């Protein structure tokens, strides 16, 4: 059981798991109501207009300058019922992910992936980092600084621009130095993409209407995999990129895909990163874990907490799976590192979650989204934790009929057809 309490958005605050919070990095936001669905995991059922000060409104760009795959609705997630349904939909997706051993292992790694205490200028002192905390306002009026790993927030202007972000440090690259940082995922359980069953069809931009709908549990697990990489500080640099040469339409558009996205999907897409680049990253982050173990061994003082230094050293020994000898010194065992590295990079992939959920999904990241649908996974007659849209002992159980947007047409209301905005590819048939 991943979510022990059933949260309702209108429930009063308590300063523990329901409270108004401020994020230290921004600080200019007015407090927002947040819910703690699990250890180190919070949910903010509001449109993200506060994390990025340069993205403080939901105004869409002019129609011509809009990304072909995008959707705008400034009224979405503005009422208390939408926020309450958003909250129940996100928790239901967490339980569906948790109902698989793959998702249970991913969520376990996310929980114990506490961002490192390395913000002190003194090399022998452990100090928390402002990036990895939030201020929890109490009924007393007092505020308590609480460190956390993951926050689920509603989308910004582009409703379907799901992404996993984090606040950057002034000096360090928290996402690429082993330290890790608190991850903020823009996500919505009320919308899902439309793809096609055939590979030649789904990877062609000119044809396709969105016959099958993506299970939002797979879409959430995708960004959770990004959060898992970034919580352990092993995310691949976004400028490390694979220029696509397998899709002709990708080629002529000059499209390129980051190694982080290819790794996150896994499957056959992860093979575009050659073994030489994979060894480069693995050896690189192995030395980053070595530096963390060295810093822990040199630690003699701790500041900002009533917790013992031995506890904080053991906490990051648990996160990075360090080994300790009779003297108490920490060391990084490379085989245990390869186990943790393979779990975060090869085991937790979108393709594997498709295999565990037994649902239909895009077979590659190098495709073209066909449409976007409005969904409601909260009612049990629409969507279940074990079966998703493919309700057992019904007609939706076979042949992914639950994800079929024509068979199970009452569960999907098409809002925008992306194929029509990819019709400029017709001009290479001359």
């Amino acid at each position, epitope marked *: 059981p991943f979510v022990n309490k059933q949260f309702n958005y209108k429930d009063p605050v308590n300063g523990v798991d329901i409270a108004y919070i401020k994020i230290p990095n921004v600080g200019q936001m007015q407090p927002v109501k947040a819910f703690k669905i699990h250890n180190k995991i919070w949910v903010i059922p509001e449109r993200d207009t506060f994390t990025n000060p340069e993205e403080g409104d939901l105004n869409p760009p*002019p129609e011509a300058k809009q990304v072909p795959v995008s959707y705008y609705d400034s009224t979405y997630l503005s009422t208390d019922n939408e926020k309450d349904n958003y909250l129940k939909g996100v928790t239901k997706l967490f339980e569906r992910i948790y109902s698989t051993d793959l998702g249970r292992m991913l969520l376990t790694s996310i929980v114990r992936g506490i961002p490192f205490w390395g913000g002190s200028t003194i090399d022998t002192e452990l100090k928390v980092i402002d990036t990895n905390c939030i201020n929890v306002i109490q009924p007393d009026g007092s505020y308590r600084s609480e460190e956390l790993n993951l926050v689920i927030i509603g989308p910004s202007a582009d409703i379907i621009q*799901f992404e996993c972000k984090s606040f950057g440090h002034e000096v360090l690259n928290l996402t690429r130095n082993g330290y890790g940082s608190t991850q903020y995922i823009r996500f919505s359980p009320d919308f899902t993409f439309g793809f096609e069953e055939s590979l030649e069809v789904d990877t062609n931009p000119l044809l396709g209407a969105g016959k099958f709908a993506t299970d939002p549990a797979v879409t959430l697990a995708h960004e959770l995999i990004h959060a898992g990489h970034r919580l352990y500080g092993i995310a691949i640099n*976004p400028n490390r990129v694979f220029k696509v040469n397998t899709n002709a339409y990708y080629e002529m*558009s*000059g*499209l390129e*895909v980051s190694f982080e*996205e290819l790794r996150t999907f896994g499957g056959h897409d992860a093979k575009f990163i050659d073994s030489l680049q994979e060894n480069e990253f693995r050896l690189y982050y192995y030395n980053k874990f070595k530096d963390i173990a060295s810093t822990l061994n040199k630690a003699k003082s701790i500041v900002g907490t009533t917790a013992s230094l031995q506890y904080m050293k053991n906490v990051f020994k648990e996160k990075y799976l360090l080994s300790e000898d009779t003297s108490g010194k920490f060391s990084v065992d490379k085989l245990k590192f390869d186990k943790l590295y393979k779990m975060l990079t090869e085991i937790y992939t979108e393709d594997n979650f498709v295999k565990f959920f037994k649902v239909l999904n895009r077979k590659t990241y190098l495709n073209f989204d066909k449409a976007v649908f409005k969904i409601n996974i909260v009612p049990k007659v629409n969507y279940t934790i074990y079966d998703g849209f493919n309700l057992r002992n019904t007609n939706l159980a076979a042949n992914f009929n639950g994800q079929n947007t024509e068979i199970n047409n009452m569960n999907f209301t098409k809002l925008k057809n992306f194929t029509g905005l990819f019709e400029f590819y017709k001009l*290479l048939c001359v």
Partner: nanobody
Amino acid sequence: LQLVESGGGLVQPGGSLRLSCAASGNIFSIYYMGWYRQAPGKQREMVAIINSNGITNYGDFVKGRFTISRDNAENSAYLQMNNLTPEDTAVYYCNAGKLRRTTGWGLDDYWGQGTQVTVSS
């Protein structure tokens, strides 16, 4: 990416001007092309934007006077400006958007040097 602008200058009120802008890719790389203008003291209004799908958007001040075209072969946009009024005096910046897929679908806003347009006599 590289954008080269052309065809600005001085116009009598009521005259015409045709702005040009050439991009360094193709219509599949650059999704939209167009023009913005910066008044002496009025932000940076959008004049005209054309899409690779043929979708056009004009500012409310245009009022059918300006028409934006795009040559798909040479990947260049043209803005035919007719009946230019003195309140159209501004610096017109060429705008282009590169299609991106690195971390999902997206567009990169790339701007030009900007050419001065003065309606005065």
